[PDB]
Coordinates of N, CA and C and ligand atoms in Angstrom, one line a residue:
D20 N -64.8 17.7 -8.2 CA -63.9 17.0 -9.3 C -63.8 17.9 -10.5
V21 N -62.8 17.7 -11.3 CA -62.7 18.4 -12.6 C -62.6 17.4 -13.7
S22 N -62.9 17.8 -14.9 CA -63.0 16.9 -16.1 C -62.3 17.6 -17.3
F23 N -61.8 16.7 -18.2 CA -61.3 17.2 -19.5 C -61.5 16.1 -20.5
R24 N -62.1 16.4 -21.6 CA -62.4 15.6 -22.8 C -61.5 15.9 -24.0
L25 N -60.9 14.9 -24.5 CA -60.0 15.1 -25.7 C -60.8 15.2 -27.0
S26 N -62.0 14.6 -27.0 CA -62.9 14.6 -28.1 C -63.4 16.1 -28.3
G27 N -63.0 16.7 -29.4 CA -63.3 18.1 -29.6 C -62.5 19.1 -28.9
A28 N -61.4 18.7 -28.3 CA -60.6 19.6 -27.5 C -59.8 20.6 -28.4
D29 N -59.7 21.8 -27.9 CA -58.9 22.8 -28.5 C -58.2 23.7 -27.5
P30 N -57.4 24.7 -27.9 CA -56.7 25.4 -26.9 C -57.5 26.0 -25.8
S31 N -58.7 26.4 -26.1 CA -59.6 27.1 -25.2 C -60.2 26.0 -24.2
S32 N -60.7 24.9 -24.7 CA -61.2 24.0 -23.7 C -60.1 23.4 -22.8
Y33 N -58.9 23.2 -23.3 CA -57.8 22.8 -22.4 C -57.6 23.9 -21.4
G34 N -57.5 25.2 -21.8 CA -57.3 26.3 -20.8 C -58.4 26.3 -19.8
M35 N -59.6 26.0 -20.2 CA -60.7 26.0 -19.2 C -60.5 24.8 -18.2
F36 N -60.0 23.7 -18.6 CA -59.6 22.6 -17.8 C -58.6 23.0 -16.8
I37 N -57.5 23.6 -17.2 CA -56.4 23.9 -16.4 C -56.9 25.0 -15.4
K38 N -57.7 25.9 -15.8 CA -58.3 26.9 -14.9 C -59.2 26.2 -13.8
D39 N -60.0 25.2 -14.2 CA -60.8 24.4 -13.2 C -59.9 23.7 -12.2
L40 N -58.8 23.1 -12.8 CA -57.8 22.3 -11.9 C -57.2 23.3 -10.9
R41 N -56.8 24.4 -11.3 CA -56.2 25.4 -10.4 C -57.3 25.8 -9.3
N42 N -58.5 26.0 -9.7 CA -59.6 26.6 -8.9 C -60.1 25.5 -7.9
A43 N -59.8 24.3 -8.2 CA -60.2 23.2 -7.3 C -59.2 23.0 -6.2
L44 N -58.1 23.6 -6.2 CA -57.1 23.4 -5.2 C -57.3 24.5 -4.1
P45 N -57.4 24.1 -2.8 CA -57.8 25.0 -1.7 C -56.6 25.8 -1.3
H46 N -56.8 27.0 -0.8 CA -55.8 27.9 -0.3 C -56.6 28.9 0.6
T47 N -55.9 29.4 1.6 CA -56.5 30.5 2.5 C -55.7 31.8 2.4
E48 N -54.5 31.8 1.8 CA -53.6 32.9 1.6 C -53.1 33.0 0.2
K49 N -52.8 34.2 -0.3 CA -51.9 34.4 -1.4 C -50.6 35.1 -1.0
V50 N -49.5 34.7 -1.6 CA -48.3 35.3 -1.4 C -47.8 35.9 -2.7
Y51 N -47.6 37.2 -2.7 CA -47.4 38.0 -3.9 C -48.4 37.7 -4.9
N52 N -49.6 37.6 -4.5 CA -50.8 37.4 -5.3 C -50.9 36.0 -6.0
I53 N -50.1 35.1 -5.6 CA -50.1 33.7 -6.0 C -50.7 32.8 -4.9
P54 N -51.7 32.0 -5.1 CA -52.3 31.1 -4.2 C -51.2 30.2 -3.5
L55 N -51.3 30.1 -2.2 CA -50.4 29.3 -1.4 C -51.1 28.0 -1.0
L56 N -50.6 26.9 -1.6 CA -51.2 25.7 -1.2 C -51.1 25.4 0.3
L57 N -52.1 24.6 0.8 CA -52.1 24.4 2.2 C -51.0 23.5 2.8
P58 N -50.6 23.7 4.0 CA -49.7 22.8 4.7 C -50.2 21.3 4.7
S59 N -51.5 21.1 5.0 CA -52.0 19.7 5.0 C -53.4 19.8 5.0
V60 N -54.0 18.6 4.6 CA -55.5 18.5 4.6 C -55.6 17.0 5.0
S61 N -56.6 16.8 5.9 CA -56.8 15.5 6.5 C -57.9 14.7 5.8
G62 N -57.7 13.4 5.7 CA -58.6 12.5 5.1 C -58.9 12.7 3.6
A63 N -60.1 12.5 3.2 CA -60.4 12.3 1.8 C -60.3 13.6 1.1
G64 N -60.4 14.7 1.8 CA -60.4 16.0 1.2 C -59.1 16.4 0.7
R65 N -58.1 15.6 1.0 CA -56.8 15.8 0.5 C -56.7 15.6 -1.0
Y66 N -57.6 14.8 -1.6 CA -57.4 14.3 -3.0 C -58.5 14.9 -3.9
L67 N -58.0 15.5 -5.0 CA -58.9 15.9 -6.1 C -58.9 14.8 -7.1
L68 N -60.1 14.5 -7.6 CA -60.3 13.5 -8.7 C -60.5 14.3 -10.1
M69 N -59.6 13.9 -11.0 CA -59.6 14.5 -12.4 C -60.1 13.4 -13.3
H70 N -61.2 13.6 -13.9 CA -61.8 12.7 -14.9 C -61.3 13.1 -16.3
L71 N -60.6 12.2 -16.9 CA -59.9 12.4 -18.2 C -60.5 11.4 -19.2
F72 N -61.0 12.0 -20.4 CA -61.5 11.1 -21.4 C -60.7 11.2 -22.7
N73 N -60.4 10.1 -23.2 CA -59.7 10.0 -24.5 C -60.6 10.3 -25.6
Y74 N -60.0 10.5 -26.8 CA -60.9 10.8 -28.0 C -62.1 9.9 -28.2
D75 N -62.0 8.6 -28.0 CA -63.1 7.7 -28.0 C -64.0 7.7 -26.9
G76 N -63.7 8.5 -25.9 CA -64.7 8.6 -24.8 C -64.5 7.7 -23.6
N77 N -63.5 6.9 -23.7 CA -63.0 6.1 -22.5 C -62.3 6.9 -21.5
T78 N -62.4 6.5 -20.2 CA -62.0 7.4 -19.1 C -61.2 6.8 -18.1
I79 N -60.3 7.6 -17.5 CA -59.6 7.3 -16.3 C -59.9 8.4 -15.3
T80 N -59.9 8.1 -14.0 CA -59.9 9.1 -12.9 C -58.6 9.1 -12.2
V81 N -58.0 10.3 -12.1 CA -56.7 10.5 -11.6 C -56.8 11.2 -10.2
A82 N -56.2 10.6 -9.2 CA -56.1 11.3 -7.9 C -54.9 12.1 -7.7
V83 N -55.2 13.4 -7.3 CA -54.2 14.4 -7.1 C -54.3 15.0 -5.6
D84 N -53.1 15.0 -5.0 CA -52.9 15.5 -3.7 C -52.9 17.1 -3.8
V85 N -53.9 17.7 -3.1 CA -54.2 19.1 -3.3 C -53.2 20.0 -2.6
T86 N -52.3 19.5 -1.8 CA -51.3 20.2 -1.1 C -50.1 20.4 -1.9
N87 N -49.9 19.5 -2.9 CA -48.6 19.6 -3.7 C -48.8 19.3 -5.3
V88 N -50.0 19.0 -5.7 CA -50.4 18.7 -7.1 C -49.7 17.4 -7.6
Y89 N -49.3 16.6 -6.6 CA -48.8 15.3 -7.0 C -49.8 14.3 -7.4
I90 N -49.6 13.6 -8.5 CA -50.6 12.5 -8.8 C -50.2 11.3 -8.0
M91 N -51.2 10.8 -7.3 CA -51.0 9.6 -6.4 C -51.3 8.3 -7.1
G92 N -52.2 8.3 -8.0 CA -52.7 7.1 -8.7 C -53.9 7.4 -9.5
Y93 N -54.5 6.3 -10.1 CA -55.7 6.5 -11.0 C -56.5 5.2 -11.0
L94 N -57.7 5.4 -11.4 CA -58.7 4.3 -11.6 C -58.9 4.1 -13.1
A95 N -58.8 2.9 -13.6 CA -59.1 2.6 -15.0 C -60.1 1.4 -15.0
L96 N -61.3 1.6 -15.4 CA -62.4 0.7 -15.2 C -62.6 0.2 -13.8
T97 N -62.2 -1.0 -13.5 CA -62.4 -1.6 -12.2 C -61.1 -1.9 -11.5
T98 N -60.0 -1.3 -12.0 CA -58.7 -1.5 -11.4 C -58.1 -0.2 -11.0
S99 N -57.6 -0.1 -9.8 CA -56.9 1.1 -9.3 C -55.5 0.9 -9.4
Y100 N -54.7 1.9 -9.7 CA -53.3 1.8 -9.7 C -52.6 3.0 -8.8
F101 N -51.6 2.7 -8.0 CA -51.0 3.7 -7.2 C -49.5 3.6 -7.3
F102 N -48.8 4.7 -7.2 CA -47.4 4.7 -7.1 C -46.9 3.9 -5.9
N103 N -45.7 3.4 -6.0 CA -45.0 2.6 -4.9 C -44.3 3.6 -4.0
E104 N -45.1 4.2 -3.2 CA -44.6 5.3 -2.2 C -45.6 5.5 -1.1
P105 N -45.1 6.0 0.0 CA -46.1 6.0 1.2 C -47.2 7.0 1.1
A106 N -47.0 8.1 0.4 CA -48.1 9.0 0.2 C -49.2 8.4 -0.7
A107 N -48.8 7.6 -1.7 CA -49.9 7.0 -2.5 C -50.6 5.8 -1.8
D108 N -49.8 5.1 -1.0 CA -50.4 4.0 -0.2 C -51.4 4.7 0.8
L109 N -51.0 5.8 1.4 CA -52.0 6.5 2.2 C -53.3 6.9 1.4
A110 N -53.1 7.5 0.2 CA -54.2 7.9 -0.6 C -55.1 6.7 -0.9
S111 N -54.5 5.5 -1.1 CA -55.3 4.4 -1.4 C -56.3 4.0 -0.3
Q112 N -56.1 4.6 0.9 CA -57.1 4.4 2.0 C -58.3 5.2 1.7
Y113 N -58.2 6.2 0.9 CA -59.3 7.1 0.7 C -60.0 7.1 -0.7
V114 N -59.2 6.9 -1.7 CA -59.8 7.0 -3.1 C -59.8 5.7 -3.8
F115 N -60.9 5.5 -4.6 CA -61.0 4.3 -5.5 C -61.1 3.0 -4.8
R116 N -61.6 3.1 -3.5 CA -61.8 1.9 -2.7 C -62.8 0.8 -3.3
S117 N -63.6 1.3 -4.2 CA -64.6 0.5 -4.8 C -64.0 -0.3 -6.1
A118 N -62.7 -0.1 -6.4 CA -62.1 -0.9 -7.4 C -62.1 -2.4 -7.0
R119 N -62.3 -3.2 -8.0 CA -62.3 -4.7 -7.7 C -60.9 -5.1 -7.4
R120 N -59.8 -4.5 -7.9 CA -58.5 -4.8 -7.5 C -57.6 -3.6 -7.6
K121 N -56.6 -3.6 -6.8 CA -55.6 -2.6 -6.7 C -54.2 -3.0 -7.0
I122 N -53.6 -2.4 -8.0 CA -52.3 -2.6 -8.4 C -51.3 -1.5 -7.9
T123 N -50.2 -1.9 -7.3 CA -49.2 -0.9 -7.0 C -48.3 -1.0 -8.1
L124 N -48.1 0.2 -8.7 CA -47.1 0.3 -9.8 C -45.7 0.0 -9.3
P125 N -44.8 -0.5 -10.1 CA -43.4 -0.9 -9.7 C -42.4 0.3 -9.7
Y126 N -42.9 1.5 -9.4 CA -42.1 2.6 -9.2 C -42.8 3.7 -8.4
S127 N -42.1 4.6 -7.8 CA -42.6 5.8 -7.3 C -42.9 6.8 -8.4
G128 N -43.5 8.0 -8.0 CA -44.0 9.0 -9.0 C -43.0 10.1 -9.3
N129 N -41.8 10.1 -8.8 CA -41.0 11.2 -9.2 C -40.3 11.0 -10.5
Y130 N -40.0 12.1 -11.2 CA -39.5 12.1 -12.5 C -38.3 11.2 -12.7
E131 N -37.4 11.2 -11.9 CA -36.2 10.3 -12.0 C -36.6 8.8 -12.1
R132 N -37.4 8.3 -11.2 CA -37.8 7.0 -11.3 C -38.7 6.6 -12.5
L133 N -39.6 7.5 -12.8 CA -40.5 7.3 -14.0 C -39.7 7.2 -15.3
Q134 N -38.6 8.1 -15.4 CA -37.8 8.1 -16.6 C -37.0 6.8 -16.7
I135 N -36.5 6.3 -15.6 CA -35.8 5.0 -15.5 C -36.8 3.9 -16.0
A136 N -38.0 3.9 -15.5 CA -38.9 2.9 -15.9 C -39.3 3.0 -17.4
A137 N -39.5 4.2 -17.9 CA -39.9 4.5 -19.2 C -38.7 4.2 -20.2
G138 N -37.5 4.4 -19.7 CA -36.3 4.1 -20.6 C -35.8 5.3 -21.3
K139 N -36.3 6.5 -21.0 CA -35.9 7.7 -21.6 C -36.2 9.0 -20.8
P140 N -35.4 10.0 -20.9 CA -35.7 11.2 -20.1 C -36.9 11.9 -20.7
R141 N -37.5 12.8 -20.0 CA -38.6 13.5 -20.6 C -38.3 14.5 -21.6
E142 N -37.1 14.9 -21.8 CA -36.6 15.7 -22.9 C -36.9 15.1 -24.2
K143 N -37.0 13.8 -24.2 CA -37.2 13.0 -25.5 C -38.6 12.6 -25.7
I144 N -39.5 12.9 -24.8 CA -40.9 12.4 -24.9 C -41.8 13.6 -25.3
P145 N -42.4 13.5 -26.5 CA -43.3 14.5 -27.0 C -44.5 14.7 -26.0
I146 N -44.9 15.9 -25.8 CA -46.1 16.2 -25.0 C -47.0 17.1 -25.9
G147 N -48.2 17.2 -25.5 CA -49.3 17.8 -26.2 C -50.6 17.2 -26.0
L148 N -51.6 17.7 -26.6 CA -53.0 17.1 -26.5 C -53.1 15.7 -27.1
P149 N -52.5 15.5 -28.3 CA -52.4 14.1 -28.9 C -51.7 13.1 -27.9
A150 N -50.6 13.6 -27.3 CA -49.8 12.8 -26.4 C -50.7 12.4 -25.2
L151 N -51.5 13.4 -24.7 CA -52.4 13.1 -23.6 C -53.5 12.1 -23.9
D152 N -54.0 12.2 -25.1 CA -55.0 11.2 -25.5 C -54.3 9.8 -25.6
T153 N -53.1 9.7 -26.1 CA -52.4 8.4 -26.1 C -52.2 7.9 -24.6
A154 N -51.8 8.9 -23.7 CA -51.5 8.5 -22.3 C -52.6 7.9 -21.7
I155 N -53.8 8.5 -21.8 CA -55.0 8.0 -21.2 C -55.3 6.6 -21.7
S156 N -55.2 6.5 -23.0 CA -55.4 5.2 -23.7 C -54.5 4.1 -23.1
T157 N -53.2 4.4 -23.0 CA -52.3 3.5 -22.4 C -52.6 3.0 -21.0
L158 N -53.1 4.0 -20.3 CA -53.3 3.7 -18.8 C -54.5 2.9 -18.6
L159 N -55.4 2.8 -19.7 CA -56.6 1.9 -19.6 C -56.3 0.4 -19.3
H160 N -55.1 0.0 -19.8 CA -54.7 -1.4 -19.6 C -53.3 -1.5 -19.2
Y161 N -53.1 -2.2 -18.1 CA -51.8 -2.3 -17.4 C -50.7 -2.7 -18.3
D162 N -49.7 -1.9 -18.3 CA -48.4 -2.3 -18.9 C -47.5 -1.3 -18.2
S163 N -46.6 -1.8 -17.3 CA -45.9 -0.8 -16.5 C -44.9 0.0 -17.2
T164 N -44.2 -0.6 -18.1 CA -43.2 0.2 -18.9 C -43.9 1.3 -19.8
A165 N -45.0 0.9 -20.4 CA -45.7 1.9 -21.3 C -46.4 3.0 -20.3
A166 N -46.8 2.6 -19.1 CA -47.5 3.5 -18.2 C -46.5 4.5 -17.7
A167 N -45.2 4.2 -17.5 CA -44.3 5.2 -17.0 C -44.2 6.4 -18.0
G168 N -44.1 6.1 -19.3 CA -44.1 7.2 -20.3 C -45.4 8.0 -20.3
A169 N -46.5 7.3 -20.2 CA -47.8 7.9 -20.2 C -48.0 8.8 -19.0
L170 N -47.5 8.4 -17.8 CA -47.6 9.2 -16.6 C -46.7 10.4 -16.7
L171 N -45.5 10.4 -17.3 CA -44.7 11.5 -17.5 C -45.4 12.5 -18.4
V172 N -46.1 12.0 -19.4 CA -47.0 12.9 -20.2 C -48.2 13.5 -19.4
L173 N -48.9 12.7 -18.6 CA -50.0 13.1 -17.9 C -49.6 14.2 -16.8
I174 N -48.5 13.9 -16.1 CA -48.0 14.9 -15.0 C -47.8 16.3 -15.6
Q175 N -47.1 16.3 -16.8 CA -46.7 17.5 -17.4 C -47.9 18.3 -18.0
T176 N -48.9 17.6 -18.5 CA -50.0 18.2 -19.2 C -51.1 18.6 -18.2
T177 N -51.0 18.2 -16.9 CA -52.1 18.5 -16.0 C -51.4 19.4 -14.9
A178 N -50.7 18.7 -14.0 CA -50.1 19.4 -12.8 C -49.2 20.5 -13.2
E179 N -48.3 20.2 -14.1 CA -47.2 21.2 -14.4 C -47.8 22.4 -15.1
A180 N -48.8 22.2 -16.0 CA -49.5 23.3 -16.6 C -50.4 24.1 -15.6
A181 N -51.0 23.4 -14.6 CA -51.6 24.1 -13.5 C -50.6 25.0 -12.7
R182 N -49.4 24.6 -12.5 CA -48.4 25.3 -11.8 C -47.9 26.6 -12.5
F183 N -47.7 26.5 -13.9 CA -47.1 27.4 -14.7 C -47.8 27.8 -15.9
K184 N -48.2 29.1 -16.1 CA -48.9 29.5 -17.2 C -48.1 29.2 -18.5
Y185 N -46.8 29.4 -18.4 CA -45.9 29.1 -19.5 C -46.1 27.7 -20.1
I186 N -46.1 26.7 -19.1 CA -46.4 25.3 -19.5 C -47.7 25.0 -20.1
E187 N -48.8 25.6 -19.5 CA -50.1 25.6 -20.0 C -50.1 26.1 -21.5
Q188 N -49.5 27.2 -21.8 CA -49.3 27.8 -23.1 C -48.5 26.8 -24.1
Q189 N -47.5 26.2 -23.6 CA -46.7 25.3 -24.4 C -47.7 24.1 -24.8
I190 N -48.5 23.6 -23.9 CA -49.4 22.5 -24.3 C -50.5 23.0 -25.3
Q191 N -50.9 24.2 -25.1 CA -51.9 24.8 -26.0 C -51.3 24.9 -27.4
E192 N -50.0 25.2 -27.5 CA -49.4 25.3 -28.8 C -49.2 23.9 -29.4
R193 N -49.3 22.9 -28.6 CA -49.3 21.5 -29.0 C -50.6 20.8 -29.0
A194 N -51.7 21.6 -29.3 CA -53.0 21.0 -29.3 C -53.2 20.0 -30.4
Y195 N -52.5 20.1 -31.5 CA -52.8 19.2 -32.6 C -51.5 18.5 -33.2
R196 N -50.3 18.8 -32.6 CA -49.1 18.3 -32.9 C -48.2 18.2 -31.6
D197 N -47.8 17.0 -31.2 CA -46.9 16.9 -30.1 C -45.5 17.4 -30.4
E198 N -44.8 17.9 -29.3 CA -43.5 18.2 -29.4 C -42.8 18.1 -28.1
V199 N -41.6 17.7 -28.1 CA -40.9 17.5 -26.8 C -40.9 18.9 -26.1
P200 N -40.9 18.8 -24.7 CA -41.0 20.1 -24.0 C -39.8 21.0 -24.2
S201 N -39.9 22.3 -24.2 CA -38.8 23.1 -24.2 C -37.9 22.9 -23.0
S202 N -36.6 23.3 -23.1 CA -35.8 23.3 -21.9 C -36.3 24.2 -20.8
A203 N -36.9 25.3 -21.2 CA -37.5 26.2 -20.2 C -38.6 25.5 -19.4
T204 N -39.4 24.7 -20.1 CA -40.4 23.9 -19.5 C -39.8 22.9 -18.4
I205 N -38.8 22.2 -18.9 CA -38.1 21.3 -18.0 C -37.5 22.0 -16.7
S206 N -37.0 23.2 -17.0 CA -36.3 24.0 -15.9 C -37.4 24.4 -14.9
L207 N -38.5 24.9 -15.3 CA -39.6 25.3 -14.5 C -40.2 24.1 -13.6
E208 N -40.4 23.0 -14.3 CA -40.7 21.8 -13.6 C -39.8 21.5 -12.4
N209 N -38.5 21.5 -12.7 CA -37.5 21.1 -11.8 C -37.3 22.2 -10.6
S210 N -37.8 23.3 -10.9 CA -37.6 24.5 -10.0 C -38.8 24.9 -9.1
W211 N -39.9 24.2 -9.3 CA -41.2 24.6 -8.7 C -41.1 24.7 -7.1
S212 N -40.5 23.6 -6.5 CA -40.3 23.7 -5.1 C -39.4 24.8 -4.6
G213 N -38.2 25.0 -5.3 CA -37.3 26.0 -5.0 C -37.9 27.4 -5.2
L214 N -38.7 27.6 -6.2 CA -39.4 28.9 -6.5 C -40.4 29.2 -5.5
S215 N -41.2 28.2 -5.2 CA -42.2 28.3 -4.2 C -41.6 28.7 -2.8
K216 N -40.5 28.1 -2.5 CA -39.8 28.4 -1.2 C -39.2 29.9 -1.2
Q217 N -38.6 30.3 -2.3 CA -38.0 31.6 -2.4 C -39.0 32.7 -2.4
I218 N -40.1 32.5 -3.1 CA -41.2 33.5 -3.1 C -41.7 33.6 -1.6
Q219 N -42.0 32.5 -0.9 CA -42.3 32.7 0.5 C -41.2 33.3 1.3
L220 N -39.9 33.0 1.1 CA -38.9 33.6 2.0 C -38.8 35.1 1.7
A221 N -39.1 35.5 0.4 CA -39.1 36.9 0.1 C -40.0 37.8 0.9
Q222 N -41.1 37.2 1.5 CA -42.1 38.0 2.2 C -41.5 38.9 3.4
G223 N -40.6 38.3 4.1 CA -40.0 39.1 5.2 C -38.6 39.6 4.8
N224 N -38.3 39.7 3.5 CA -37.0 40.0 3.0 C -37.2 41.0 1.8
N225 N -38.2 41.9 1.9 CA -38.4 43.0 0.9 C -38.5 42.5 -0.5
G226 N -39.1 41.3 -0.7 CA -39.3 40.8 -2.0 C -38.0 40.2 -2.7
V227 N -36.9 40.1 -2.0 CA -35.7 39.5 -2.4 C -35.5 38.0 -2.0
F228 N -35.2 37.2 -3.0 CA -34.9 35.8 -2.6 C -33.7 35.6 -1.7
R229 N -33.8 34.8 -0.7 CA -32.6 34.4 0.1 C -31.6 33.7 -0.7
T230 N -32.1 32.9 -1.7 CA -31.1 32.1 -2.6 C -31.7 32.2 -4.1
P231 N -30.9 32.7 -5.0 CA -31.3 32.9 -6.4 C -31.6 31.5 -7.0
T232 N -32.6 31.5 -7.9 CA -33.1 30.3 -8.6 C -32.6 30.5 -10.0
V233 N -31.9 29.5 -10.6 CA -31.4 29.4 -11.9 C -32.4 28.7 -12.8
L234 N -32.9 29.5 -13.8 CA -33.8 28.9 -14.9 C -33.2 29.0 -16.2
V235 N -33.8 28.2 -17.2 CA -33.5 28.3 -18.6 C -34.6 29.1 -19.1
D236 N -34.3 30.2 -19.9 CA -35.4 30.9 -20.5 C -35.9 30.4 -21.9
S237 N -37.0 31.0 -22.5 CA -37.5 30.8 -23.8 C -36.5 30.6 -25.0
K238 N -35.3 31.2 -24.8 CA -34.3 31.2 -25.8 C -33.2 30.2 -25.5
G239 N -33.3 29.4 -24.4 CA -32.3 28.5 -24.0 C -31.1 29.0 -23.3
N240 N -31.2 30.3 -22.9 CA -30.2 30.9 -22.0 C -30.6 30.8 -20.5
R241 N -29.6 30.5 -19.7 CA -29.7 30.2 -18.3 C -29.7 31.5 -17.6
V242 N -30.6 31.7 -16.7 CA -30.8 33.1 -16.1 C -31.1 32.9 -14.6
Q243 N -30.7 33.9 -13.8 CA -30.9 33.9 -12.3 C -32.1 34.7 -11.9
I244 N -33.0 34.1 -11.1 CA -34.2 34.8 -10.6 C -33.8 35.2 -9.2
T245 N -33.9 36.5 -8.9 CA -33.4 37.0 -7.6 C -34.5 37.7 -6.7
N246 N -35.6 38.0 -7.3 CA -36.6 38.7 -6.6 C -37.9 38.6 -7.3
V247 N -39.0 39.0 -6.6 CA -40.4 38.8 -6.9 C -40.8 39.7 -8.1
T248 N -39.9 40.6 -8.6 CA -40.3 41.4 -9.8 C -40.0 40.7 -11.1
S249 N -39.5 39.4 -11.0 CA -39.2 38.7 -12.2 C -40.5 38.2 -12.8
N250 N -40.6 38.2 -14.2 CA -41.8 37.7 -14.8 C -42.2 36.3 -14.4
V251 N -41.2 35.5 -14.0 CA -41.6 34.1 -13.5 C -42.5 34.2 -12.3
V252 N -42.3 35.2 -11.5 CA -43.2 35.4 -10.3 C -44.4 36.2 -10.6
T253 N -44.3 37.3 -11.4 CA -45.5 38.2 -11.7 C -46.5 37.6 -12.7
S254 N -46.0 36.7 -13.6 CA -46.8 36.3 -14.7 C -47.0 34.8 -14.8
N255 N -46.1 34.0 -14.4 CA -45.9 32.6 -14.9 C -46.5 31.6 -13.8
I256 N -45.8 31.6 -12.6 CA -46.2 30.6 -11.5 C -47.6 30.9 -11.0
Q257 N -48.4 29.9 -10.9 CA -49.8 30.0 -10.5 C -50.1 29.4 -9.1
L258 N -49.2 28.6 -8.6 CA -49.4 27.9 -7.3 C -48.1 27.7 -6.6
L259 N -48.2 28.0 -5.3 CA -47.0 27.8 -4.4 C -47.1 26.6 -3.5
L260 N -46.1 25.7 -3.6 CA -45.9 24.6 -2.6 C -45.6 25.3 -1.3
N261 N -46.4 25.0 -0.3 CA -46.1 25.5 1.1 C -44.7 25.1 1.6
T262 N -44.0 26.1 2.2 CA -42.7 25.8 2.8 C -42.7 24.7 3.9
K263 N -43.9 24.5 4.5 CA -44.0 23.5 5.5 C -43.8 22.1 4.8
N264 N -44.0 22.0 3.5 CA -43.8 20.7 2.7 C -42.5 20.7 1.9
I265 N -41.6 21.6 2.2 CA -40.3 21.7 1.5 C -39.1 21.4 2.5
Ligands
LIG30 N1 -46.1 10.6 -6.5 C1 -45.7 11.6 -7.3 C2 -44.3 12.1 -7.2 C3 -44.0 13.1 -8.0 N2 -44.8 13.7 -8.9 C4 -44.4 14.8 -9.8 O1 -43.0 14.8 -10.0 C5 -42.5 16.0 -9.7 C6 -41.1 15.9 -9.3 O2 -40.9 15.3 -8.0 P1 -39.3 15.2 -7.6 O3 -38.7 16.6 -7.5 O4 -39.3 14.3 -6.4 O5 -38.7 14.4 -9.0 P2 -37.2 14.0 -9.3 O6 -36.7 14.9 -10.5 O7 -36.5 14.3 -8.0 O8 -37.2 12.6 -9.7 C7 -43.4 16.6 -8.7 O9 -43.2 18.0 -8.5 C8 -44.7 16.2 -9.3 O10 -45.1 17.1 -10.3 C9 -46.2 13.2 -9.0 O11 -47.0 13.7 -9.7 N3 -46.5 12.2 -8.2
LIG31 C1 -34.6 42.1 -9.3 O1 -35.1 41.5 -10.4 C2 -35.2 42.3 -11.6 C3 -36.0 41.6 -12.6 O2 -35.4 40.4 -13.1 C4 -33.8 42.6 -11.9 O3 -33.6 43.5 -13.1 C5 -33.1 43.3 -10.8 O4 -31.8 43.7 -11.2 C6 -33.2 42.5 -9.5 N1 -32.9 43.3 -8.3 C7 -32.5 42.9 -7.1 C8 -32.2 43.9 -6.0 O5 -32.3 41.6 -6.8

């Protein structure tokens, strides 16, 4: 398991968390020096438990699918909650079985559905360490509309930061003041699958992508990534979704 406490948190302790989260995900190969997540993992070992504590010391445990860094659900006191999707229903066979009751949330976990439920796109939802503390707090008691927003924060500040050093840095810069994500951050989130695929297809193609990936950069300019020499590949991306899952 991995843990993160908001009480006393700073950029360093957050970076240690995100490093622990990355290191907890299994891999047997690197591709261009980036860990390649596994095609599949059977049974319970498929799910990492993240223990998150708000500033007051209250806690939820979040279940994460180690093949794709997808959050499946969470435990808050004696109630478990899972996304309304088959992968989460499967996860509920393995994690938090000791919950006194299990609630299926009224949406799946993908960004489009969560934004619909929350009533706003994630361009408009501030993220940061304060936002994470609020998210955890919200998730402690069921409210499905409030939870959608909370989960959009939680996904970005855990999984998406594990995937991209740039995103991890963006949260660090919001350690004490929330701010909506940069467009670059949004772009990288949306491109993770595509990037992961193209980096893998590059291996038998002399480091060249079969299909260019369009990102937004730090300055809000849209740019094409065509090969493994790009800083998105050498510096930024930390985890690859296996092509078998794409
Ligand atoms: N059950 C789920 C589903 C998605 N997600 C997250 O949402 C991201 C986007 O999934 P997607 O590409 O299907 O989202 P949409 O923009 O298509 O709605 C994933 O890469 C995960 O970071 C999650 O944490 N748990
Ligand atoms: C490869 O990417 C680098 C870095 O972005 C770029 O300057 C170069 O023009 C690209 N070359 C090819 C052959 O795709």
